[PDB]
Amino acid sequence: QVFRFYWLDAYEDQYSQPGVVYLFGKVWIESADAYVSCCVSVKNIERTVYLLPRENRVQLSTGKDTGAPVSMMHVYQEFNEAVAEKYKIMKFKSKKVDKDYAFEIPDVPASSEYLEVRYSADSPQLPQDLKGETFSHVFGTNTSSLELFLLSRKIKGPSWLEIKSPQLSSQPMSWCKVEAVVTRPDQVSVVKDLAPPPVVVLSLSMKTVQNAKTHQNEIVAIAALVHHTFPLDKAPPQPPFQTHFCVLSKLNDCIFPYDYNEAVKQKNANIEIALTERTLLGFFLAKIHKIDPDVIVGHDIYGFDLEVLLQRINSCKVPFWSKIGRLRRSVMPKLGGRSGFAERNAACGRIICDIEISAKELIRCKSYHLSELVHQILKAERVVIPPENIRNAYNDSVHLLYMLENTWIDAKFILQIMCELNVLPLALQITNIAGNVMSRTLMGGRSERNEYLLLHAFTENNFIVPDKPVAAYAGGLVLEPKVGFYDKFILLLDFNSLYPSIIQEYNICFTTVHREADEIPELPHSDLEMGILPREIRKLVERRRHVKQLMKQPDLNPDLYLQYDIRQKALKLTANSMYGCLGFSYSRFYAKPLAALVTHQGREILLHTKEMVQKMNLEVIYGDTDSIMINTNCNNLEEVFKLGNRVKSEINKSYKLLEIDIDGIFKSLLLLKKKKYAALTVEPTGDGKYVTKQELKGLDIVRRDWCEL
DNA sequence: TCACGCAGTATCCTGT
RNA sequence: GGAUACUGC
Numbered sequence: 001q002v003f004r005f006y007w008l009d010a011y012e013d014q015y016s017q018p019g020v021v022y023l024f025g026k027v028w029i030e031s032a033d034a035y036v037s038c039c040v041s042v043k044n045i046e047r048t049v050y051l052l053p054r055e056n057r058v059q060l061s062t063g064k065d066t067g068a069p070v071s072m073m074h075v076y077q078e079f080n081e082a083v084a085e086k087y088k089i090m091k092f093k094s095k096k097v098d099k100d101y102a103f104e105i106p107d108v109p110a111s112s113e114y115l116e117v118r119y120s121a122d123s124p125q126l127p128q129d130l131k132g133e134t135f136s137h138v139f140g141t142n143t144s145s146l147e148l149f150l151l152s153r154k155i156k157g158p159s160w161l162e163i164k165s166p167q168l169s170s171q172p173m174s175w176c177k178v179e180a181v182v183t184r185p186d187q188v189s190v191v192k193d194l195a196p197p198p199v200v201v202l203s204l205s206m207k208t209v210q211n212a213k214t215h216q217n218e219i220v221a222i223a224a225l226v227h228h229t230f231p232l233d234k235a236p237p238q239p240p241f242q243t244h245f246c247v248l249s250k251l252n253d254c255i256f257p258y259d260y261n262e263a264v265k266q267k268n269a270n271i272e273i274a275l276t277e278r279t280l281l282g283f284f285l286a287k288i289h290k291i292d293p294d295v296i297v298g299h300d301i302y303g304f305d306l307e308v309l310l311q312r313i314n315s316c317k318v319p320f321w322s323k324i325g326r327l328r329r330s331v332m333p334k335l336g337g338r339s340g341f342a343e344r345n346a347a348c349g350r351i352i353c354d355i356e357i358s359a360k361e362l363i364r365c366k367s368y369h370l371s372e373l374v375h376q377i378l379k380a381e382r383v384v385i386p387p388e389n390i391r392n393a394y395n396d397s398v399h400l401l402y403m404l405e406n407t408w409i410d411a412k413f414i415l416q417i418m419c420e421l422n423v424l425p426l427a428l429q430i431t432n433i434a435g436n437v438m439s440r441t442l443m444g445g446r447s448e449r450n451e452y453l454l455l456h457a458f459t460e461n462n463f464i465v466p467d468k469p470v471a472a473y474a475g476g477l478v479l480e481p482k483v484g485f486y487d488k489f490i491l492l493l494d495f496n497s498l499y500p501s502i503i504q505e506y507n508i509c510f511t512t513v514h515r516e517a518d519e520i521p522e523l524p525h526s527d528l529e530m531g532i533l534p535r536e537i538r539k540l541v542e543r544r545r546h547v548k549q550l551m552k553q554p555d556l557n558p559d560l561y562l563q564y565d566i567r568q569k570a571l572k573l574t575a576n577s578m579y580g581c582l583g584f585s586y587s588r589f590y591a592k593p594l595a596a597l598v599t600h601q602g603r604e605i606l607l608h609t610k611e612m613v614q615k616m617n618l619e620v621i622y623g624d625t626d627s628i629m630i631n632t633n634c635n636n637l638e639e640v641f642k643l644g645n646r647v648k649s650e651i652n653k654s655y656k657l658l659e660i661d662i663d664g665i666f667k668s669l670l671l672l673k674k675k676k677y678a679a680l681t682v683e684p685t686g687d688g689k690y691v692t693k694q695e696l697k698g699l700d701i702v703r704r705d706w707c708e709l
Numbered sequence: 710t711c712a713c714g715c716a717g718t719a720t721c722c723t724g725t
Numbered sequence: 726g727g728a729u730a731c732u733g734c
């Protein structure tokens with residue numbers, strides 16, 4: 001009876017079905033002794049709102065303070081008599097909860113006794129600014145259903161969930177193989193310490209042609225590579241694809257060169273030849289339904305691939321468009337909108353991986369075209385089929401087969417790139433750390449991840465989170481450089497996780513600093529307890545540190561090492577974003593004061609460090625917001641290292657959690673301008689010997705807007 | 710429906 | 726005064 005399944009994606013429709021969340025994932029079946037797709041519909045996720053009592057009764061804001069003390073009974077009576085009837089709410093359940101609060105709404109105390117009202121999602125929605133006579137504010141009016149489910153059930157990222165007493169479905173509701181319905185959200189729980197299951201993956205590449213008359217792109221070939229046991233916690237499987245399927249359709253005008261039959265006969269039996277685009281799209285939809293991939297990967301999938309797929313399906317009236325997704329629906333989502341949210345909805349329940357977004361997030365390249373990505377990652381050369389030659393290729397069997405094989409090779413390249421960067425395992429790790437949905441993580445961006453991280457952190461610690469929204473401050477300090485050429489060892493001292501360590505050390509948090517709705521707030525007292533933001537930051541930092549320790553293992557494979565490096569970078573960025581969102585205008589946690597303070601402290605720190613170095617009678621020639629370059633004026637490497645250690649210790653002696661380390665020893669330096677220099681980093685091998693590696697920072701030579709020559 | 714912060718260097722244009 | 730790029734942290 002207990003349904004144990006691994007959940008990968010969640011989809012909700014705020015307008016069609018209120019209070020229903022469609023989780024999708026994998027379940028284990030002994031009859032087939034394998035893993036099959038499952039769709040669980042959590043129902044009746046009741047709206048929860050919090051009412052804040054007033055200290056003194058106010059005559060509907062007309063007579064102002066009246067002097068009558070207000071208790072929870074007064075608030076409940078006011079809600080039951082006036083608000084409920086006015087806004088057409090039939091049935092609700094109310095209780096009292098003591099909750100804390102520290103955010104950007106004034107007159108809301110730190111810890112207050114709120115009245116929590118729970119009522120179905122079918123009823124209307126109370127206004128945000130609703131003010132009565134006993135309560136001064138209402139929180140949670142527009143909270144989404146998925147957010148409520150995830151936060152209430154403490155679900156963070158893909159994981160194993162147990163459902164008690166599942167129910168079947170009166171009629172089919174999904175294209176999966178197993179379905180269940182949960183009548184309450186309390187029946188779903190998370191079970192920890194279990195391995196992720198394998199997930200099917202389909203890498204697809206399309207080749208189209210632009211019909212000038214309609215200016216609409218028409219599909220002529222599709223290729224797909226499918227793996228049925230792709231892991232989410234281990235290295236990619238070699239080879240990266242198990243099976244494949246290719247479909248080729250004749251254009252609306254041209255005809256085959258009277259030899260396609262023999263060509264396909266002698267080539268292979270896995271190529272399906274169709275005569276009309278309708279048949280091609282139908283066969284593709286049927287194949288997608290049969291394979292049932294949990295991850296669909298491609299290049300420009302959000303931009304061109306899926307948009308053109310849906311457009312052609314609509315134009316050709318191909319039956320059963322919903323096969324492209326995992327939920328059976330009648331009305332297509334509206335074509336348009338920013339990014340690919342319409343495309344995401346069209347493929348609801350199926351994770352979509354655009355290697356362009358992941359490449360932009362993970363690595364840096366001059367261009368993110370497929371050719372450049374293959375050149376830089378896989379180190380291979382990809383041939384390009386001119387757009388004007390695809391149409392003319394329908395004149396010989398050899399050329400058409402070559403076109404189809406080119407599409408196949410493009411799909412293989414996409415899958416190989418996906419495997420190389422560890423897009424999927426890294427996405428899973430980031431999602432688990434943050435707590436968002438995996439599709440959101442793979443769509444790119446940083447705001448959502450930190451938003452959900454802080455949401456979970458605050459909800460777990462008995463807080464009322466804000467309501468979703470419906471050069472502004474000083475930054476770092478860049479010391480004036482002594483531009484020139486230095487032929488002696490240059491010692492670079494860099495701080496470790498500067499801003500996160502500042503947040504931890506000085507205890508900068510929402511609940512610690514006293515903000516007032518553009519001046520730098522005072523540092524919080526040292527007699528308080530560590531807040532939520534510091535603790536979370538610490539966690540992230542520790543994760544990164546552990547990864548670095550792994551990177552330090554001796555005799556490690558190159559590729560694996562690189563992977564670890566990428567991971568480190570990701571985590572660092574996450575922490576930095578946890579800082580930066582504090583000054584993000586459109587963030588759910590806009591706390592510009594706090595961020596300002598952070599930066600200010602950083603500046604102070606740098607200043608102090610510089611002063612100390614000068615008190616040691618050394619020379620300081622550069623520094624960018626956490627670093628100092630010292631002209632050792634020496635040529636004995638060992639001695640330089642000694643000095644490093646010395647100053648390092650000295651600096652550390654002033655701080656508890658902050659740390660400074662030797663970020664590099666430059667044999668020679670060419671310091672041109674602020675944030676523009678070159679050097680020969682010294683990597684010691686042992687016995688006093690060392691190798692030199694060229695390093696450039698900010699020079700035009702490392703910019704993409706100049707001719708390669 | 711979206712989207713991390715700020716400091717800094719380089720190039721180019723201002724008619725109806 | 727403005728506009729367009731992309732480095733640094």
Ligand SMILES: Nc1nc2c(ncn2[C@H]2C[C@H](O)[C@@H](COP(=O)(O)OP(=O)(O)OP(=O)(O)O)O2)c(=O)[nH]1
Pocket residue numbers: 494495496497498499500572573576577579580625626713714734
């Ligand atoms: N908001 C934001 N801030 C950043 C980003 N990159 C760097 N910073 C800021 C915050 C960092 O604490 C500060 C110091 O830069 P670093 O590159 O030396 O990183 P950090 O010291 O945090 O760690 P590390 O020296 O690599 O161990 O610069 C970023 O991508 N976003």
Ligand SMILES: [Mg+2]
Pocket residue numbers: 494495496497498626
């Ligand atoms: Mg640093």
Ligand SMILES: [Mg+2]
Pocket residue numbers: none
């Ligand atoms: Mg000026």
